[model samples]
Target: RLDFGLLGPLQMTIDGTPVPSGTPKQRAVLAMLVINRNRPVGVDALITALWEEWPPSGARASIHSYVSNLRKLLGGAGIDPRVVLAAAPPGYRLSIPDNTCDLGRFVAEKTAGVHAAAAGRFEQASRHLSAALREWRGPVLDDLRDFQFVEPFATALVEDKVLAHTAKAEAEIACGRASAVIAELEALTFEHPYREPLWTQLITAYYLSDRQSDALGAYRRVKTTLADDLGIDPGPTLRALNERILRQQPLDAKKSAKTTAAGTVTVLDQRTMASGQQAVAYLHDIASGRGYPLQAAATRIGRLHDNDIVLDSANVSRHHAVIVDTGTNYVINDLRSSNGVHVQHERIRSAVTLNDGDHIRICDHEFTFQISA
Candidate 1:
C-alpha cells in the first residue's frame, strides 16, 4: 500500500520505500490530487494551484504530462496499474485509499482526542492527542506553500497543530504530568506567541507543577509581550487566571499515573515511564543521540577535568556551569563564566531551572535538557 505523507514534505512511500516524486510541477500536481483524494479536483483547480493569475496556453497539456509522469512514478514503484489515477469528470480523480493519507489520520485522531477530552476522559484524550500530534512530522506541506491554493490549507493545518498540542498538554496536566509538558508548552508558546490559549496553558502547567512564582512570572511575561508586541493587555480570562493564582484559588487537582478503565497503556504514560526509567535529568545532543546523564547532585560543565559533558573548544569556559539536581527539579548555574550559558538564546545569570526539551547552549556546544517525558 502507498502511504501519502502530506504533513511535512510531499512524500509517497510505497511498501516502506520512498518513491521519487518527479519534477517540481509533478510534485505540485500530485500534492493537489492527494489533498482531494478519493474525489475529483477540477482541472481549473489544478491550474489555479500551479500557475499565478494566468496559466500558459499549453497549461492543460502540461498538466496531463504531469499526471502521466505521476502514474508512471507510481507504477514504477510496483503499485497496481489498475486505474489508480483515473481520468474522469471535470479534471481527474485519484483512487488513493483514505487510510493511507496522513492528513486523514491526523484529523480523525484529533477528533477522537477532543471528544475524549470533552467527556473528561483524559487518558483516552492523551492517547488520541499524542497519536494526532505525532502524525505531524513537521510543518504541513512545508515545501509546497508557495503554491497559490496550498497556503490557506497550510495555515489551517498549523492552527490544527496548535490545537492538538494544546489539548495534548491539557491532558498531560490532567494526568498530573504537568512538569513533563512544560518544555513542550514552552516550545509551543515560543512558536505561537500570539496565541493566548498556548500562553494560558503554559501558565497553568507551571501552576499545576506547584511553581506559583513561575506561573505568575509567565503571566507577567505574557502580559508584557501582548502589550508590547500587539498593543493589547492579556485577555479577560487570562487576567482572571492571574488573580486566581494570586489568591491561591484551588484549581482542578491532578491525578498521577492514572490508568483508564480499558487498561490500555497510553503513549504519554509509556513516554513518561521510559524517561523515568532512563534518567531523572539528562542533556541529549541534538546532532548525535548521545545523552549526558545529570545523575549526580552537582555536575560540572566545561573544559575542566572530567566535566560531565566536555566542550574543549575555545568558545567554552574551563568551568562554565554547574547542573544541580534539586530533588524536584534541575537548576543550572552559569558559574560566572567568560562565555556564559545560554538557554534558548538568552544568557543566564545565577541559576535557571531546566525544563525538558529546553535548548541549552554553552557557546558552540548545544544540548536539549530533558526530565520526565
Candidate 2:
C-alpha cells in the first residue's frame, strides 16, 4: 500500500520504500488534490493557487501535463485501487476509499481522542491523542512551504495540533501525571508564548503538581510576556487562575498524586541540564537569558516561529540554519540564508563542527554555543 504524508516533507512511501514526489509543479498539484482529498478542485483554483496575480500562457496545458505525470506516479499502469486520481472536467479529485495519509489518520485519531476526553475517559483520550500527535514529523508540507496555497489549510491544521497537545496535557494532569507534562508544555509555550490556552494548561500542570510558587512564576512570565510583547493582558480565564493561585485557594481540578503545597523549589541553573549532568551542548541567548539545549536530534534555528530555536529578530532569515549532534561531535550547518551562520567571527559556508564556547551568530542574534561533558 502507498502511504502519503504531509506532516513533514512531501513524502510518498510504497511498502516502506520512499518514492520521489516529482517536479515542483507536479508536487503542488498533487498537494492541492490531497488537501481537498475526495473533492474536485477546479482548474481555476489550481491556477490561482499556483500563481500570484496572473498565470503564464498555456496554463491549462501545463496543468494537464503536471497531472498526467502525477497520475502515472500514483500507480504503475495497473488497477491499483488505493487511490484513483480521476479527471472531473473542472480539474481533478483523488478518490481515496480509506484515507491512509498521515494527515487523514491524524484527524481521525484526534477526533476519537476529543470524544474520549468529552466522555471523561482521560487515560483513553491521552493514548489516542498521543498516537495522533506522533503522526507529525514536522509542520505540514515543510518542504513545500513556498506554495502560498498551503497557508490556510496548514494554519488550521496546526491549530488543531496545538489544541490536541493542550488536551493531552489536560488529560495527563487529570490522571496525576502533571509533572510529566512540564517539559512538554515548557517547549510548547516557549514556541507559542502568546497562546493563552497552552499557558493556562501549563500553569495548571505546575499548580496541580504542588509547585504553587512556580505556577505563580509561570503566570508572571506570561503576564509580562503578554504585556511587553502584545500590550495585552491574559484573557479572563488565565487572570482568574492567577488570583486562585495567589489566594492559595483549593483548586477545583483535584490532583490525585503526591500531597504537598509549600515545598521548596530547586531551581536548576540556566546553563546546566536539569539532571545536573552537563548538557551535550546548548545555545545560550546572550541577550534574552534563555537557553536552548541541543539534543541528539536536529535543532533548527531561524526567525520563523516554528523553528526549533527561534531567533525573533528581523534580520534573521526564516529557515536560517540547523544544528545536529553527530554522536561524537556537534555540527552546525548554514541553510543558505541571507546572512550565514558564523562561529569565531568567521562565516561558515558548509557544516562546521562546533567546539566548546564557540561564538555563533545568525544575523542579529548572537549565541554562544557551549559543549560540556
Candidate 3:
C-alpha cells in the first residue's frame, strides 16, 4: 500500500515505513505525486510547481528518470511499481485510493462538519470537526522545503485548519459550552485581539460564566490593545458588545434570549465623541494617546481588527483609550482597552456620556477631562 501524507511534511509510507530517496528531484517527484494523489497532474503542472517555469535542458528526461527511480523504490517496498507510478494521459497519478490517506479523511470530516453547522446541528458539527482537526500535526508539507508542488496543498490545508478551529469554537459555544471555551478562546483572542468575532466569543464566554466584570474587562482589553498597537478603533461588533455590557444587556447567542435586567451600570465619562473620519485621520496619533502625555490605549472593533491593540510595551499600563463625548449627555465609552480602563469603580466598557470632571483609568494612570462646550 502506498500512502501520501499532505497534512504535514510530504512523507510516503510504503507498507508503513518512510522511503529514502537520495536525489532532490526524486523527492520532488514523490512529493508532487502525494500532493496530486489519484489525479493526473499534468507534466506541465509538475514542471511549473517544481522548477518555477525554468526547466533545465534535460528536465523531461530528468523527470522520467526520477519517476523510474521512484517506481523501483516502490517495487522494492513490496508494491507494484505501476501502482505508485501510473502512466496516465495528462501526467501521472498516485493510484492510492481516496480516504486511505490521512489528508483525505481530514478533508472529508471538515466538509461534513461545515455541512452540519450550516444545517444548525452544532453538536454534531463540533464532534465531527474536532476529530478531523486533530489530525494536523503541524504545518502541511512543513519539511518539503525544496518542492513547490506541495505549496498549494499546504496553503489549502492551513486555511482548512483555521476554518475548522473557527467552526469548532462556534459549535462549542452553541452547545452551551460557552464558559468551557474560555481558556482556549481567551488565548486565541489575546493573540488575535483585533479579531472582533473572537473577542465577541470571548466576551460571551465570560458573560456566560457569570464573570460579568471579566466579560466587560475583556472587551476593554481588546479595544485598548488595538488602539495602542495599531491605532485603529474596534469594529461594529466590538463596539456593540461594549454598549451591551455597559447597558448590562445579555449576550446575543444562538440559544439564549437577550437578558432584560436593570442593573447598576458602569460608565466611562469623557468629552467629545471622535468623528469616524476624525478617528481615521488621526488614528495613529489618537491611538498613541495623542496629547494625553502618558500612554493611551486604542481598541479596534472586536472582530474586525485581528484582536486587541496596545501602545509601546513600555507603556503597557497606559494602553487604554478613553473617549469623552462633548455633547450635553457627554457619553463616555471605554475603547475596551488593556490594563483595564475603568469608569467610576467598574471595570467594563462604559457607555455613559461624559461631562467635565469625569474620570478614566489606564492601568494605574488616571486622567480627568473637562468637556468644553
Candidate 4:
C-alpha cells in the first residue's frame, strides 16, 4: 500500500512507514508529476517549471537525471518503477489509483461537496467539504514555496481550501449552528481581509445568533479595511446588508415583532417562529388515520426520545431533519437521513423553505405545514 501526500509537504509512505523524498529539486519534480498523475507532462513544460525564465546549462539533462534517480528510489523501496512512473512519448506520467494519492482524494471529495451544495443538501455538503478540508495539514507544498511552479499550484489549493471552509460555514449556519461558526468566520475574515463573502458569512452568523451589535461592528471593520487599503467602499451586497442590520429589518432582527391576519406571528422577519410559540405541522398517517401536531421550532425531528418531534416509525433516523425558523420562514433540512424529507413529492437534499399549504413527508409520515400563533 504505497501512498503519496501532497496536501502538506510531499510525503511518501509504503505500508505505513515513511520513505525519503529526494532533494528539493527532485521533490519539485515529483510534486509536478504527482499533481498531474496519469497524464503526461511534456519535457518542455517540465523544463520551464523547473527554471521559470532562467535555466542553467544542461537543465534538461538535470531533469532527466532527477527522474531517473526518483525511479531508482521508488524501486529501492520495493515499488514497481515501470508501473508507478512511466515514460510517455513526450515526458512522464505517474499512474496509480486515485485513492493512493491524498490530492486525488481531496479533489474527488471537494467535487462531491460542491455537487451536494448545488443540490441544496447542506448537511451532506458540510460533511463532504469538511472531509476534503481535513486532508490539508497546512499550506499545500509549503516546503516548495521557493519554486515558481509550486507557488501558483499552492496558491490555487489555498484558495480552494478557503472556498471549502466558507461553504461548510454556510451549511452549518443553515443547520442552526451559526453560533458555532462565528469564531471561525471571524478568524477567516481577519486572515483574508479582502474576501467579502467571508465577511458576509460572519455578519450573517452574528446577526442570526442575536449578536446585532457584533454583526454591525463586523460590517464596520470590513468597510474601514476596504476603504483604507483598497480606496473603495464595501460592495453593494455588503452595503445592503449593513443597511438591513441598521434598520433592524424584521428578517434580520432577533425577534418576531409582527403578526399576520391568520394570527401567526412573523418572527425573524419571515423565516422563523418566535420563541415560546411553536408553528404546527398537522401530520396525517395515511394508513392509520391518526393525526397529531408536529411542532416546528429550531429543534430536531427524529426517533430519539430527546428529539423535539419524535416519530415512532423505524424509517425515521435517530437525528433526522432539523426544522429551523429563519426569522421569516420555517425551513426543513434533512440531516443526511436514510429516508429523506420530501417537499411536494420531491426529496430534498438541502433545506426546503416551507409555505403554509406545502405538503411534507418525513420518513413514513406525511404532514401539511401550518402556523399557530
lDDT of 3 at 146: 62
Per-residue lDDT over 144-183 for candidate 1, one digit per residue giving the tens place of the 0 to 100 score: 7777445445554665577678778778888878899999
Clashes of each: 0, 0, 50, 17
Relative to the true structure, how large is the alpha-carbon lDDT of every model?
0.73, 0.72, 0.58, 0.70
Write the residue-wise lDDT of candidate 2 on 274-302 in tens digits: 68663557898888877888742346678
Rank ordering of all candidates by lDDT, starting from the highest: 1, 2, 4, 3
Candidate 3, after superposition: displacement of residue 359 in Å? 48
TM per candidate comes to: 0.66, 0.66, 0.59, 0.64
Clashing pairs in 1: none
Candidate 3: lDDT of 292? 34
Query: Which of 2 and 3 is ahead in lDDT?
Result: 2
* Stretches of model 3 off by over 4 angstroms after superposition: 21-24, 76-79, 146-153, 190-196, 224-234, 255-373
> Which pairs of residues have clashing backbones in candidate 2?
none
- Which window of ten consecutive residues has the lowest lDDT sum in model 2? 258-267
Tens digits of per-residue lDDT for model 3, 1-373: 6666656766667777877754766677776676456657667656655675478988878888878888888786677788667988888877777576777778667666755666667788788878888777677767776664343344335444554665677778778888888898878775555556677777877877788899889888888888997677889867887788778877646432111000000111122244522121112222334433211111211122222333444444331342321111233344444545555555644344333445555554454644332
Q: Which stretches of candidate 4 lie over 4 Å from their true place?
A: 76-79, 250-373
Q: Report the error of model 2 at residue 320, Å.
A: 29
